[PDB]
Design an enzyme around this catalytic site. Structure first.
Site, PDB file in Angstrom:
ATOM      1  N   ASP A  35       0.851  -1.192   0.000  1.00  0.00           N
ATOM      2  CA  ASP A  35       0.000   0.000   0.000  1.00  0.00           C
ATOM      3  C   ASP A  35       0.884   1.238   0.000  1.00  0.00           C
ATOM      4  OD1 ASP A  35      -1.907   1.858   0.295  1.00  0.00           O
ATOM      5  OD2 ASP A  35      -2.417   1.365   2.389  1.00  0.00           O
ATOM      6  N   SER A 199      -0.802  15.673 -11.896  1.00  0.00           N
ATOM      7  CA  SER A 199      -1.056  15.327 -13.290  1.00  0.00           C
ATOM      8  C   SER A 199      -1.302  16.590 -14.104  1.00  0.00           C
ATOM      9  CB  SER A 199      -2.251  14.373 -13.366  1.00  0.00           C
ATOM     10  OG  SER A 199      -2.675  14.134 -14.661  1.00  0.00           O
TER      11      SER A 199
END
Length: 330
Positions: A35, A199
């Site tokens: 994770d 992004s």
């Protein structure tokens, strides 16, 4: 040193991936969920409340000649999905894919929430976010990656998740055979303890690319892609009959649909998520309503590039003094 381990989807939907991890001496192999959005290595154990264990493999420290209680240390964690676990701490030898760390904090669960009990395939979590998020008190502990780092050939790990197929976690090297083209690296903020990046925008299907900054985290422990409501509405508007269902808890679509792809930007590069990656199947067994793999982040407080996005790429988690993320197509 290096390590290389195969990661395997737990079910036919790629809801999560499990990676075998050796703990203790002699080795006890547990299948952990790696994770990148948390920083605790915790396991089902001989200490876990018996009614909360249903099929998991447990770690038994008393059977490990290298286990030592980390006296006084406790831990307690709550995840984004409402799940939780807590317990006490041992140090022991932990190996992943041939890479060994001695003295790793292994957090032994005394209690786990129902979602963990109900998932017999996941024996615990191995956190790969920054060690500033580790929950051990009163002495915070390091992740497996942070403890391994100085021994690695390069201070990196890579995630290469499969679509309905096994993939790979590598530590200490970048497998140049595992991706196509070049790797585009992007800046990381560690201010919240995550692999947080920005992004450069998105496209829906064959549509034009929208240049827009989307800050979010690279999180292998989250199944879906959670983005701003504007972006998510723009995607689902291209699917006839898709709608947001408050009763189901997100966007659903007709199982008869063909989904468009979703592109996200990494600098000037582009990662394309095929439409089939965004199909999470019937909402309930036999339903003709299917659950979408792109969902709104608006009720979270962060955008999450979970497995739906990451499995479309070869992802480099660069843990050098100035961390960076890299993405390549594959």
């Amino acid at each position: 040193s290096t390590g290389s381990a195969t990661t395997t989807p737990i079910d036919s939907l790629d809801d999560a991936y499990i990676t075998p991890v050796q703990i203790g001496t002699p080795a006890q192999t547990l299948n952990l969920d790696f994770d990148t959005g948390s920083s605790d290595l915790w396991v089902f154990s001989s200490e876990t409340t018996a009614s909360e264990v249903d099929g998991q493999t447990i770690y038994t420290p008393s059977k490990s000649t290298t286990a030592k209680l980390l006296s006084g240390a406790t831990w307690s964690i709550s995840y984004g999905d409402g799940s939780s676990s807590s317990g006490d701490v041992y140090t022991d030898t932990v190996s992943v894919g041939g890479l060994t760390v001695t003295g790793q904090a292994v957090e032994s669960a005394k209690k786990v929430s129902s979602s963990f009990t109900e998932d017999s395939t996941i024996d615990g979590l191995l956190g790969l976010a920054f060690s500033t998020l580790n929950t051990v008190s009163p002495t915070q502990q390091k992740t497996f990656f942070d403890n391994a780092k100085a021994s690695l050939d390069s201070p990196v790990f890579t995630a290469d998740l499969g679509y309905h197929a096994p993939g790979t976690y590598n530590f200490g090297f970048i497998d140049t055979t595992a991706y196509t083209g070049s790797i585009t690296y992007t800046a990381v903020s560690t201010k919240q303890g995550f692999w947080e990046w920005t992004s450069t925008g998105y496209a829906v299907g064959s549509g034009t690319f929208k240049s827009t900054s989307i800050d979010g985290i690279a999180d292998t422990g989250t199944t879906l892609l959670y983005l701003p409501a504007t972006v998510v509405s723009a995607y689902w508007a291209q699917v006839s009959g898709a709608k947001s269902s408050s009763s189901v808890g997100g966007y659903v679509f007709p199982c008869s649909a063909t989904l468009p792809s979703f592109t996200f930007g990494v600098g000037s590069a582009r990662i394309v998520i095929p439409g089939d990656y965004i199909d999470f199947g019937p909402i309930s067994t036999g339903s003709s309503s299917c659950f979408g793999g792109i969902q709104s982040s608006a009720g979270i407080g962060i955008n999450i590039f979970g497995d739906v996005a990451l499995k479309a790429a070869f992802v480099v988690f660069n843990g050098a003094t100035t961390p960076t993320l890299g993405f390549a197509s594959k």
